[PDB]
Structure formats: structure tokens, C-alpha cells
Design an enzyme around this catalytic site. Structure first.
Site, PDB file in Angstrom:
ATOM      1  N   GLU A 103       0.820  -1.198   0.000  1.00 40.02           N
ATOM      2  CA  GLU A 103       0.000   0.000   0.000  1.00 40.02           C
ATOM      3  C   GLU A 103       0.861   1.258   0.000  1.00 40.02           C
ATOM      4  O   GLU A 103       0.724   2.096  -0.889  1.00 40.02           O
ATOM      5  CB  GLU A 103      -0.978  -0.035   1.182  1.00 40.02           C
TER       6      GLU A 103
ATOM      7  N   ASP B  55      -5.297  -4.686  -3.701  1.00 38.16           N
ATOM      8  CA  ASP B  55      -5.620  -3.264  -3.839  1.00 38.16           C
ATOM      9  C   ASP B  55      -4.390  -2.386  -4.023  1.00 38.16           C
ATOM     10  O   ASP B  55      -4.469  -1.355  -4.695  1.00 38.16           O
ATOM     11  CB  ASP B  55      -6.537  -2.742  -2.720  1.00 38.16           C
TER      12      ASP B  55
END
Length: 642
Positions: free
Chosen positions: A60, A228
Site C-alpha cells: 500500500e 488493492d
């Protein structure tokens, strides 16, 4: 903590971006490791949420680091940053060939050995079942290999940058993992451990027998991605490429584009049931083709092998969260020439997936507009029959909080901003009509929940509460009149504010391009969020913006019992003893020497929530990027004190 920004009225959003960028990249500020230049989760070391320590890094953080540089190239013409960021990414957090021994011995016909998942960490280790459970087949490993080789090109999600846990040599960055034990294993209830298990620390079988009960224990390696992050990094690269080409400087990002393209190809691994069981079986029925593909970004892909003798395995995940979809990156890899997958089936699978993700959002939309949590192909992690009245999506069961229940994985409003921002970019770039009602309803919901105050402050939703179920998916939105969301608390989360702003500015730009007219309210609201986040949370000593937050949950530093199997004994690299009855702090003893330990201990003693100031890397980046989106689509717009 925060003070008021001195910034002059009339300052372009471009200039605000550049000021913030400059601060995030200043070595004296310490957002990145001094030796290798890896982004830390936050300047501060003492912090506990997804990661349980500040100077870990995450995939991330890296995806945000790429995004920050893509925007900087856009506003400035200097592209070297995008290359730096991707280089750092591939040196450290993507396992190279050396770090994946025996991947070559992976068998698409025997991907992995089944094991149950349990409603409590007290059920682990979970027993591998070579015996009475036939897994399905991996229909994707073959064309990925054919194009790229045996190795995997994904990011492992978590790295101990300065070896604070001690699992590695000296001060060397080390792959670690934590969550391993089901839906009730919070950040407080885990036992951190090395990905590269050499038995050097832990117990007799390092940490292996904490999580998986096997017939025998061999030295091994294991990685876990959080899709993600890859989605965001590629999304970022789509923009670097667009903005680079517009300038006649596309060659400065071409090699990153190719890598991003490759990464997108490997994300097909996230499209499959944990153990390649058929989607919708409600049973342990193995699958042959793409019968195991749900075509969403599931919570993770995990893979690994042996260090000693060569063997290998891979899992998908049966659980899907709306917050983890990226129909934008999906659409990039499916349609954009430069991001065309090298594999022979990649483009096809992506074409199926990005569309399938767009239907997922629509299915999950509450009557109010916020997006509900997601769905699973494996009820209780054990492929049980769906309870009566369970509404489904292509056979998968609706779940309010996919993966984690402590806290509920769909309590955080942040996923709304993060994941719907991607939809906005998708609408911006395609003008896709089928997405218009979804977007408008979500915008209306969010607009009704942002609070602006005459004194120049703001509040946005923080915690969400869900009831009911969507209607079962028929291919078309019903309005789900029995699926409800309520906001139960609000706050001032800077990163989410930025991301929400981004989403509204992007959306507004999309109304200007595709619709009768510009959505003026969305544009102005985005500017309001950016002005108020910057003005109210400015860091006077030059570090960007800064949070002030009450952390009631930090009592768990001291009260939370971490489960250790009865009779199991082991040691952390520093001597801390792993045995039954340990508290979070007990295996994390070096925390007592953290500059902010005293403040959270003395706060615990008085039975009060400590108040902390954080400069998280992603908070600064989401805010800075929001500024850059305003600079990009509304270049006349100009900061003023709110």
C-alpha cells in the site's frame, strides 16, 4: 499537533501540491528509510492498525509512493521519480527469483493442500488435509509461466524495513507476516513471524505449528499480496503514461508501464477461490477450468515453497471486499494497448473481471447509497451450505464484513472513498453509462454526510453500521430497499478526506466531459475538503499535515491476550517469550523503549484514551494527490482559508 496553515489566499492547488510533495520527500522529515529509501507506514514508530508498527512498510505505501510521483511528473515534467519509486518497489517488496526457490516445481493440478478456517484464533493450528479433500485446478498458472517464467511478480504486503522484529540479519529489511488465524484475529491478537522460515527463531518448528498442523515441518518461504496495492500502483501508472505522453516524455515511464502491465497480469491469481473450488458449490467440489474464478480481487493471493527440497503451492481467496476492487486498473489491463498483458489469455480474463467488478459495486449499494461489504465462496471458511435466505452474487454469499470481524472490515468509511474513487476515474475515462446511477447515488449519499462548519473545520464519516442484505443479483440494480447503512461516528481523518475529495473532483471532471454540464457542487466540495484538511491540520515544523487522534484501542497494548497453543513454546529474536497468557506488548518488548510508550502506558494506568499525532505516508499522499486532481481538471481554482 496541528496548527493553522499560514498559506496565502489565491495559492494554486498546483503550488499546494508542490509544497506538500517537497515536504513528503525531504530526507530531514523521515517518511522514507535512510538506507534504501523505502516508504514507512508513518513517521511515528508507535502505531497499531493493519500494520502493528510504524516502520514496517506495506505494498500500500508503495502504491501510494508511485501515485505521488505520477502526479509530480504531471504537474512538473520531471519523470525520474516514477522510475525511482518502481525501482525501490522491485528491489525490496517484490520477491525476486532468489526469494522464490522451487516455484518451478509448482503443480497446477495440485495447487495446494486444503485446510479449514476458524471463527477464533484458539482453533489454530488448522490441520492440512492431504487425505480427504481434493482441491481444484489452477487454469491460469500455465499462460502466466509461458509469458514470464516460473516466478510471481506481485508485492508481498508487509516488510520489516529496519528489522525491528529482529528476524533478519543486522538492520536488513525482512519480509514478515502477521494475520494467519481467521476472522477474529485482530492486529492485537497476532504473532508476527518471518516469511522466510529458517527455524532460526520462534519454537522448534519456527512459527509454522502456530498456524498450520502438518505431518512434518520443513524450512519454507511464504508470501501474501494485498491486491488493492497492485491495483493502485497500476492505476497510478496509467496516469503517469497519459501525462508523460501528453508532454512528449513517454519514454521516461515506458519500462515502468511494461512492469505495471506484468503486475496486472499476475493479479489474475487474486480472481480464484482459495482452493479452486467451484463458485457457488456450497461444498468442497474441486474445479477444472475457470469454474473457480469469481473474477474479483479477493482479499489475497498466497504462495510459497520449500527452502530445502523443491516443492511449491498457491492459494487464491474465497472472500471478496468491495473496498479492494479496482475496475479502473481492471479496465486498463483489459483495453489499453500499452498495458496489454503478455500472457495469451490475460486481456480476455481482465475484460471479464473489470465488468464483473462493476456489477459487484452495483449489487452492494445500500438504499442510502454507501457500498456494502462483499461476498464469499466459502461460508465460514469451510465451504458450508449458505444459511436460509442468503442473498447471492453469481453464487457467492453476501457478507457484511468480509475476512475480519475485529473490527468489522466494512466499518471503516475509508473504503468508500478509496474504492469509489476508482469508479470515478473509470467513468471519467470511459463515459460508461451503466455506472451512472451507482455513481450519482453514492455522491448524493456522501454529500449528505460531509459536515462543514462556519469556523472553517469539517467532519466526515468514520464508522459505518450495516443492516439487512442486498437483493440477490439478477444483473440489474433493484435499489436494495432492505440494505441499510448508518454513520455512527465522524472525524477528521486527513487521508480519507483527501481521497474523498479526489473522488468528488474526479467525478465532477467526469460530469463536465460526458454530461450536459459540470457538477459544480461536487467540484466545490472537493475544494472545501482540501482547503479544510490543509488549513486545520498543517504541521508547523514543515512535515506536511498532521493528525490528532484519540486511540481508545491502545489499551489493548496491555489488556489483549494473544493466543498460544497449550504446550507451545518459543522465543522472539530479542528474548521475549512466546507462551500461553501473553499480552500484545509481551512479544513486542522493544516497544517499551519507543518515544511514545510512556504516553500510552500512563494513559492506560489512568484508564483513558491516549491522544496521538500521526504523519502517515498515505494520509499525506491522498491529500497531495487530491490537490493534484484539482490542479489537473480545475487549473483556475485556488486555495483560500475556509
Amino acid at each position: 499537533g496541528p496548527t493553522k496553515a499560514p498559506t496565502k489566499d489565491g495559492t494554486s492547488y498546483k503550488d499546494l501540491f508542490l509544497e506538500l510533495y517537497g515536504k513528503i520527500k525531504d530526507p530531514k522529515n523521515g517518511y522514507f528509510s535512510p538506507d534504501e529509501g523505502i516508504p514507512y507506514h508513518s513517521i511515528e514508530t508507535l502505531i497499531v492498525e493493519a500494520p502493528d508498527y510504524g516502520h514496517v512498510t506495506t505494498s500500500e505505501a508503495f502504491s501510494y509512493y508511485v501515485w505521488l510521483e505520477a502526479m509530480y511528473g504531471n504537474l512538473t515534467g520531471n519523470w525520474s521519480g516514477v522510475e525511482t519509486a518502481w525501482k525501490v518497489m522491485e528491489d525490496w517488496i517484490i520477491p525476486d527469483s532468489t526469494e522464490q526457490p522451487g516455484m518451478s516445481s509448482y503443480n497446477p493440478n495440485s495447487p495446494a493442500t486444503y485446510a479449514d478456517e476458524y471463527e477464533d484464533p484458539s482453533y489454530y493450528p488448522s490441520e492440512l488435509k492431504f487425505d480427504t479433500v481434493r482441491v481444484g485446478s489452477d487454469p491460469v498458472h500455465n499462460d502466466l509461466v509461458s509469458a514470464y517464467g516460473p516466478n510471481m511478480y506481485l508485492m508481498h504486503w508487509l516488510m520489516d524495513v529496519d528489522n525491528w522484529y529482529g528476524f533478519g540479519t543486522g538492520t536488513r529489511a525482512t519480509f514478515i507476516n502477521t494475520f494467519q488465524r481467521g476472522e477474529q484475529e485482530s492486529t492485537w491478537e497476532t504473532i508476527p513471524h518471518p516469511s522466510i522460515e529458517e527455524f532460526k527463531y520462534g519454537g522448534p518448528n519456527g512459527f509454522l505449528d502456530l498456524f498450520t498442523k502438518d505431518r512434518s515441518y520443513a524450512k519454507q518461504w511464504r508470501y501474501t499480496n494485498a491486491p488493492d496495492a497492485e491495483g493502485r500502483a497500476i492505476q497510478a501508472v496509467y496516469w503517469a503514461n497519459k501525462w508523460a505522453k501528453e508532454q512528449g516524455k513517454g519514454s521516461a515511464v515506458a519500462s515502468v508501464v511494461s512492469k505495471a502491465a506484468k503486475m496486472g497480469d499476475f493479479l489474475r491469481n487474486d480472481m480464484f477461490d482459495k482452493y479452486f473450488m467451484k463458485i457457488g458449490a456450497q461444498d468442497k467440489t474441486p474445479a477444472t477450468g475457470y469454474d473457480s474464478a469469481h473474477y474479483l480481487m479477493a482479499w489475497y493471493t498466497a504462495w510459497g515453497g520449500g527452502i530445502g527440497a523443491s516443492w511449491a503451492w498457491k492459494i487464491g481467496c474465497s472472500h471478496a471486499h468491495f473496498g479492494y476492487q479496482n475496475p479502473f486498473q481492471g479496465w486498463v489491463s483489459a483495453t489499453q494497448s500499452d498495458f496489454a498483458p503478455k500472457s495469451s489469455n490475460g486481456k480476455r480474463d481482465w475484460t471479464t473481471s473489470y465488468k464483473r467488478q462493476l456489477e459487484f459495486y452495483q449489487w452492494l449499494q445500500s438504499a442510502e447509497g454507501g457500498i456494502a461489504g462483499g461476498a464469499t465462496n466459502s461460508w465460514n471458511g469451510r465451504y458450508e451450505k449458505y444459511p436460509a435466505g442468503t442473498s447471492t452474487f453469481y453464487g457467492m454469499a453476501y457478507v457484511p464484513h468480509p475476512v475480519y470481524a475485529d473490527p468489522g472490515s466494512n466499518q471503516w468509511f475509508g473504503f468508500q472513498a478509496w474504492s469509489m474513487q476508482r469508479v470515478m476515474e473509470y467513468y471519467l475515462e470511459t463515459g460508461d453509462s451503466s455506472v451512472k446511477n451507482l455513481i450519482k447515488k453514492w455522491v448524493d449519499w456522501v454529500m449528505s454526510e460531509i459536515k462543514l462548519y462556519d469556523d472553517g473545520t469539517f467532519a466526515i464519516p468514520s464508522d459505518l453500521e450495516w443492516s439487512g442484505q442486498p437483493d440477490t443479483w439478477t444483473g440489474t440494480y433493484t435499489g436494495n430497499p432492505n440494505l441499510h447503512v448508518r454513520v455512527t461516528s465522524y472525524g477528521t481523518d486527513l487521508g480519507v478526506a483527501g481521497s474523498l475529495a479526489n473522488a468528488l473532483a474526479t467525478y465532477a471532471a467526469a460530469t463536465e466531459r460526458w454530461e450536459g454540464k459540470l457538477d459544480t457542487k461536487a467540484r466545490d466540495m472537493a475544494a472545501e475538503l482540501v482547503n479544510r484538511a490543509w488549513y486545520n491540520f498543517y504541521c508547523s515544523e514543515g512535515k506536511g499535515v498532521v493528525t490528532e487522534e484519540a486511540r481508545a484501542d491502545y489499551k489493548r497494548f496491555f489488556e489483549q491476550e494473544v493466543y498460544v497453543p497449550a504446550g507451545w513454546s518459543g522465543t522472539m529474536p530479542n528474548g521475549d517469550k512466546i507462551q500461553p497468557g501473553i499480552k500484545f506488548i509481551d512479544i513486542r518488548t522493544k516497544y517499551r523503549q519507543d518515544p511514545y510508550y510512556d504516553i500510552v502506558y500512563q494513559a492506560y494506568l489512568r484508564g483513558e484514551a491516549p491522544v496521538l499525532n500521526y504523519h502517515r505516508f498515505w494520509h499525506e499522499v491522498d491529500l497531495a494527490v487530491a490537490m493534484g486532481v484539482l490542479a489537473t481538471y480545475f487549473p483556475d481554482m485556488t486555495y483560500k482559508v475556509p
